[PDB]
Structure 1
Amino acid sequence: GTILIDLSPDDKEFQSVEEEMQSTVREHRDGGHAGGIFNRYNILKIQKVCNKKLWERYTHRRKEVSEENHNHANERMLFHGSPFVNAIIHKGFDERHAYIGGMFGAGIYFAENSSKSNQYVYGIGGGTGCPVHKDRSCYICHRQLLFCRVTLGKSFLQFSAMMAHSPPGHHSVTGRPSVNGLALAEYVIYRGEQAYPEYLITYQIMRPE
């Protein structure tokens, strides 16, 4: 029951999502190995993901978390990159979309930095890059990221150089960077119902001039 609605580039909603995508690019400690070498994107399309059942699944869980946390869902908008983007938008997040080997355990991982999520669009470590050219830094092939509504609730703070259950008494984990002063936070949820894939963003990475 998913439909995708194209946003016009003239729409304020398109512009605000594009700005979050572009403004949260950073350099990565791998020199571009996983996600490619780029400072910005060419945004090709932004689509709203509409699914009544998945939205109601999300809001139901959000209310449960809010009620366990002094009426505070602690809702964020965060990026997610995955080879399973097309499954996620149709069936929702679940255990199959977890990063089993993630540093905060087997859960579903999200980033404040769009460029962090870009490292996972072709798999863990960028896999073998794009299917057409086998290039993790492909400037031709179209990539997709999700910009997701995520319920964190009470989040367990992990200081770090950067499914399972949430730590007891918590609804998520926050990976705070403790080495790279430019990195933004990363977050992990352990219930697929705590995220909704609100925007599907189609883009290319751009070769630096």
Structure 2
Amino acid sequence: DDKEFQSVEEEMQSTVREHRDGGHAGGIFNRYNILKIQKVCNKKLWERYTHRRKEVSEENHNHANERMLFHGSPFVNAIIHKGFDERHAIGGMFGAGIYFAENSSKSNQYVYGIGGGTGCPVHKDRSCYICHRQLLFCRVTLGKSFLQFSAMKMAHSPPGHHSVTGRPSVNGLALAEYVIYRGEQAYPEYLITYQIMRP
């Protein structure tokens, strides 16, 4: 458990980047105080995930193209019990999808809502150093992933594809993002409780 969770902690800290908004959405910090890392064991969600992963693999030259990615949401507790649900997803960069990041600090910008919302419920602060936040570190099946640079408002995956990869560009994205259009293509494997730390 210790080495498995240290690997999660390393992924969480090492993928932090300096954000263009100067910390507006997610707060100002260089690292986190990781409080707890819990493995989510939801058999029904796991099987919904693996059934779809097998299907996608068969449609993508025997390859699921699975990645471990972060997800930030004010609804992590509904996600761990009921799973990711595309019915809760159009106005986003790549449309009506479920978004993930390979940089934990990008997902951190979504923990209190879009653009950070009004921050924590207690102090109404997007840069709250006191209130404990939660992120998910997820197993995500990308399958055949459609590489895109500019905004493309999809309702579903592009024809013949299983996801969209938003790649960084001068005029566009600062960091990558990964988008699925079917909730069963992600499993909320780790629940991370943490605080952002004052630099």
* TM-score for the superposition, normalised by structure 1: 0.90
1:161: Cα distance to partner?
8.7
Name the CA distance, whole Å, in 1 between partners of 2:58 and 2:151.
Answer: 33
User: C-alpha deviations, 1:15-37, integer Å up to 9, x for none?
Assistant: 00000000000011101000000
Contact 2:94 2:151 in 1 (8 A): no
Contact 1:161 1:178 in 2 (8 A): no
Q: 1:24 to 1:181 in 2, by over 3 A?
A: farther
Q: Match for residue 121 of structure 1?
A: 111
Q: 1:33 to 1:161 in 2, by over 3 A?
A: farther
Name the CA distance, whole Å, in 1 between partners of 2:10 and 2:151.
Answer: 27
Contact 1:160 1:177 in 2 (8 A): no
Contact 1:41 1:203 in 2 (8 A): yes
Contact 1:65 1:171 in 2 (8 A): yes
Q: 1:95 to 1:152 in 2, by over 3 A?
A: same
Q: Which has the higher strand share?
A: 1
In structure 1, list runs of 5 or more residues that go unmatched.
Answer: 1-9
Deviates more, 1:190-199 or 1:152-161: 152-161
Name the CA distance, whole Å, in 2 between partners of 1:180 and 1:165.
Answer: 25
1:180: Cα distance to partner?
8.6
User: C-alpha deviations, 1:32-88, integer Å up to 9, x for none?
Assistant: 000000000000000000011000000000000000011000000000000110000
Contact 2:34 2:195 in 1 (8 A): yes
1:95: Cα distance to partner?
2.1
Matched length: 198
For residue 27 of structure 1, give the secondary structure of its aligned residue in structure 2.
coil
Name the CA distance, whole Å, in 2 between partners of 1:195 and 1:182.
Answer: 23
For residue 53 of structure 1, give the secondary structure of its aligned residue in structure 2.
helix
Name the CA distance, whole Å, in 1 between partners of 2:173 and 2:182.
Answer: 29
User: C-alpha deviations, 1:136-168, integer Å up to 9, x for none?
Assistant: 000000000000000000000002499821001
Q: Match for residue 102 of structure 2?
A: 112
Q: 1:161 to 1:97 in 2, by over 3 A?
A: closer
In structure 2, list runs of 5 or more residues that go unmatched.
Answer: none
Q: 1:182 to 1:65 in 2, by over 3 A?
A: closer
* TM-score for the superposition, normalised by structure 2: 0.95
Name the CA distance, whole Å, in 1 between partners of 2:171 and 2:10.
Answer: 23
Q: 1:37 to 1:166 in 2, by over 3 A?
A: same
